[PDB]
Design a binder for this molecule. Structure first.
Ligand SMILES: [Mg+2]
Length: 439
RNA sequence: GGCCAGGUAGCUCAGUUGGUAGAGCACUGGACUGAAAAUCCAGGUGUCGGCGGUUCGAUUCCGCCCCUGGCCAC
């Protein structure tokens, strides 16, 4: 039930100056875990607290001291957020009450999802170290295993099933047998929890670069298919299409790691700088774009228009899962034009590619260009093209980038403006354009 | 504090490259019928939440706020 500078944080002093003498505080969950696993503290810090005093007051005064922002939400829990450019701080204060402090702490630690997250230390021992792990989290961290405290705790809050999938990949741990068994039983249980949370955990999975294996895990057990029924529809078309999407995602990640070679400088400049949902990038949207790259093949076949229908389906998924409108529109636009570089390459291999089509390409979509390129290369890798084909593709991309880098520098008024911009690349020309427009 | 979605005629709802805000229902009137229902025809001066900015021109593009709701430990 117990065991015995490492857990230190600069802000743990501040909390201590706030928390009253007669009340106690405990550091619980991920932070502790992250410190036990030995992973270096990143640029995003999240600390979880259990206090015997009013968490709202404590948090408000803490934010008062650190000059951060404070908010409360629903028992009722409090949180403080301190955000500057290099780092992000989130401190979540939770209520702890009972006649017996130790018994209350223990009872709380048994209601948590996983053993790793059930470890807690006393705040007074942090700055000066007896640890509380009734679920035996440390022992499981010694074996590198993520083991749910109980299955009833997982059923109590279904969304936890995704965290276990994320954390295992995030902290590099292996999920136990009982978890996979519970997932085998009822994969649909995930749907019981709120949608936006599922969206959040999914995006958190897509954040890391090993995500394709996790996606395969979620698909194979039917969880992914249960959250997104459109994914299963890839099984009715025998190429296997689903395998092709999974491998497209894998190769997409392997390309993302190597992305510095394939793309040019100006394209890589703003790559991954697009903030979606206030913590995520367009890279995750690129991975979603790779999973969804063909969602329309079961829709239309004999797949001529499958990219348009695909864009529509993606739009509906984004609407259904409550993504950002800019996000879902980004992914939909990424699926819509997903086959464009293949037609540009195919027109290049015949030498029939001209500045017209390039101008149209950069006019039509210049924002999704890097992502569309990486996705095209990924799909080319997943299709198993001959060397000549892929080389020709990368050469096509090269000529495109080389083209845009240098050579690109009452409809009456609109048509006039368009014709002017076209003729530019001199008011008499405008007068003549008007005289020609009259006829 | 962060993010997400709505705010439009009386109600409830369309308006994904910008180009005078229309359609259905509801409402009124007429034809028709002993009568009524049905059927057929006609009728929109709406500060597109507020203020600004880009544009020749903004319901749509951009920035700052307002109101309603949804999520935010492990
Ligand atoms: Mg935490």
């Amino acid at each position: 039930x117990x065991x015995x500078l490492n857990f230190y944080l600069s802000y743990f002093d501040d909390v201590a100056k706030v928390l009253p003498r007669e009340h106690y505080c405990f550091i619980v969950g991920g932070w502790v875990r992250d410190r036990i696993l030995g992973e270096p503290v990143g640029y995003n810090i999240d600390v979880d607290f259990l206090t015997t005093a009013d968490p709202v007051e404590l948090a408000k005064n803490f934010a008062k001291r650190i000059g951060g922002h404070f908010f409360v939400f629903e028992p009722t829990i409090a949180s403080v957020v301190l955000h500057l450019p290099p780092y992000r701080y989130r401190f979540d204060f939770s209520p702890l009450k009972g006649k017996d402090l130790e018994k209350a702490l223990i009872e709380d630690l048994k209601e948590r999802d996983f053993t790793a997250n059930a470890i807690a230390v006393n705040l007074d021992d942090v700055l000066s170290t007896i640890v509380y792990d009734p679920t035996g989290g440390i022992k499981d961290l010694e074996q590198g295993l993520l083991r749910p405290v109980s299955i009833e705790n997982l059923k109590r809050d279904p969304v936890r099933v995704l965290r276990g999938f994320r954390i295992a990949i995030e902290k590099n741990l292996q999920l136990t047998e009982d978890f996979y068994e519970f997932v085998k039983e009822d994969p649909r249980i995930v749907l019981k929890s709120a949608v936006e949370r599922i969206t959040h955990e999914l995006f958190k999975i897509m954040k890391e670069k090993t995500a394709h294996k996790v996606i395969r895990e979620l698909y194979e057990y039917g969880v992914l298919e249960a959250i997104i029924p459109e994914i299963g529809r890839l099984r009715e078309v025998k190429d296997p299409l689903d395998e092709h999407t999974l491998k497209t995602l894998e190769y997409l990640e392997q390309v993302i790691e190597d992305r510095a070679k394939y793309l040019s400088a100006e394209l890589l400049e703003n790559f991954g700088k697009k903030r979606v949902l206030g913590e995520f990038t367009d890279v995750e949207l690129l991975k979603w774009g790779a999973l969804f790259h063909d969602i329309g093949k079961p829709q239309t076949f004999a797949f001529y228009e499958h990219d348009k229908v695909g864009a529509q389906i993606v739009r509906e998924i984004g609407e259904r899962l409550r993504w950002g409108d800019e996000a879902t529109e980004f992914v939909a636009k990424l699926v819509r034009h997903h086959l464009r570089p293949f037609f540009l390459r195919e027109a290049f291999k015949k030498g029939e590619l001209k500045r017209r089509g390039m101008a149209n390409f950069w006019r039509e979509c210049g924002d999704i260009a890097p992502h569309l390129f990486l996705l095209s290369i990924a799909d080319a890798m997943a299709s198993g093209d001959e060397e000549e084909d892929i080389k020709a593709l990368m050469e096509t991309i090269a000529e495109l980038e080389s083209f845009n880098r240098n050579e690109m520098k009452x409809x009456x008024x609109x048509x006039x403006x368009x014709x002017x911009x076209x003729x530019x690349x001199x008011x008499x020309x405008x007068x003549x354009x008007x005289x020609x427009x009259x006829x």
